[PDB]
């Protein structure tokens, strides 16, 4: 419901008798209340690429859970050799992140979280790793049902 | 003095008359602020006895202050 751009690039395939220049757009969609997703698109001009990216991201929409407005347990997410390290932020400290990570975390309806990036930063790979790490989230009810004890500790 | 210019300070400090100011010493008896004198001084009233009982009498400028506090009366008990 925000649809802010992340990184737009010029790409071109080379073919006999001319190469085709086109625009590639990366988008991320989030209601700020739980439904999040991301997508890529390419087209000859802006409007077609934007529409394609919006449709692709809307199709891949999936929900996410909120733990006291924070990520209550540590997570080290990996995808394409780009480590993302996310840890809980105590409420009353604010949210810190870099641009792409800033947009990702604010778009998911997360209040605050402490983030760090290891490895060579790359937009699409970093987004994939962050989404894989966030979708890996656990929950106290999950550990309760997979354990014998029915309490958090 | 120590502390601040135009706002002096001198801690009541146990030391023997051998070295300079603000250096080696034995105990920290207390402190007096001359910037506001209303017959009051930070004194432990117990450790000063031990300091006096091992020689090293304090700086000469505090005798009236200790008499005001009431340390000389209980210190001269040894020579009684």
């Amino acid at each position: 419901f925000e649809e802010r751009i992340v990184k737009l690039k010029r790409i071109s395939k080379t073919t006999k008798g001319g190469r085709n220049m086109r625009f590639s757009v990366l988008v991320v969609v989030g209601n700020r209340k739980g439904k999040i997703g991301y997508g890529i698109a390419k087209a000859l001009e802006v409007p077609n690429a934007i529409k394609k990216a919006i449709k692709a991201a809307h199709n891949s929409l999936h929900t996410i859970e909120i733990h006291k407005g924070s990520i209550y347990h540590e997570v080290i997410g990996r995808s394409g050799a780009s480590r993302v390290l996310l840890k809980p932020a105590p409420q009353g400290t604010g949210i810190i992140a870099g641009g792409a990570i800033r947009a990702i975390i604010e778009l998911a309806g997360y209040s605050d979280i402490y983030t760090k990036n290891l490895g060579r930063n790359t937009p699409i790979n970093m987004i994939h790793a962050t989404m894989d790490g966030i979708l890996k989230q656990l929950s106290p009810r999950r550990v309760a049902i997979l354990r014998n004890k029915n309490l958090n500790e | 003095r120590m502390g601040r210019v135009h706002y002096p300070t001198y801690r009541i400090v146990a030391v023997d008359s051998r070295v300079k100011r603000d250096g080696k010493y034995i105990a920290l008896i207390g402190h007096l602020n001359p910037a506001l004198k209303e017959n009051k001084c930070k004194i432990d009233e117990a450790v000063a006895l031990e300091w006096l009982n091992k020689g090293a009498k304090p700086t000469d400028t505090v005798r009236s202050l200790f008499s005001q506090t009431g340390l000389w009366k209980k210190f001269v008990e040894s020579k009684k």
């Binding site: 347990h73 656990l138 550990v143 997979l146 354990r147 004890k149 958090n152 500790e153 | -």
Partner: protein, 141 residues
């Protein structure tokens, strides 16, 4: 009870049990066996009383000349092991010992670490209750 194809002790209790656990949860194997020892018995005891593990048995043929332990894993009808991750902190080349207030906690309290101070291994919450620190050996969650 019978198990041919004789097994071999890997190098030590903790590393062997942890690598067996990781390979089992990767291969969804029910039963995993290893060589018996007091430390491994204690580890199996704590990990089965903490609700992360299925039946565990210790057996011998006639003496301690051939004494082994074996254990199963807690699962679900949807083919998902109860455990999800493990990392050993103590290694044969390095053992770190920590005081009370330097006691680590996993996930945020969700995971259980295994700490032995003077009375065998135990859970983190009990060690903090007795305010005894000591050495950790592994994080499981």
């Amino acid at each position: 009870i019978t198990t041919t194809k004789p097994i071999k002790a890997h190098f030590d209790p903790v590393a062997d049990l942890l690598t067996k656990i990781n390979n089992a949860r990767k291969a969804k194997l029910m039963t995993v066996t290893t060589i018996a020892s007091k430390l491994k018995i204690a580890i199996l005891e704590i990990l089965v009383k903490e609700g992360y593990l299925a039946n565990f048995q210790v057996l011998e043929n006639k003496s301690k000349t051939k004494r082994i332990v074996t254990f199963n894993l807690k699962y679900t009808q949807r083919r998902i092991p109860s455990i999800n991750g493990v990392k050993q902190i103590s290694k044969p080349g390095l053992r770190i010992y920590r005081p009370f207030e330097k006691l680590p906690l996993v996930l945020n309290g969700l995971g259980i670490a295994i700490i032995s101070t003077s009375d065998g291994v135990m859970t983190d919450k009990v060690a903090r209750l007795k305010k005894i620190g000591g050495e950790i050996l592994a994080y499981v969650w």
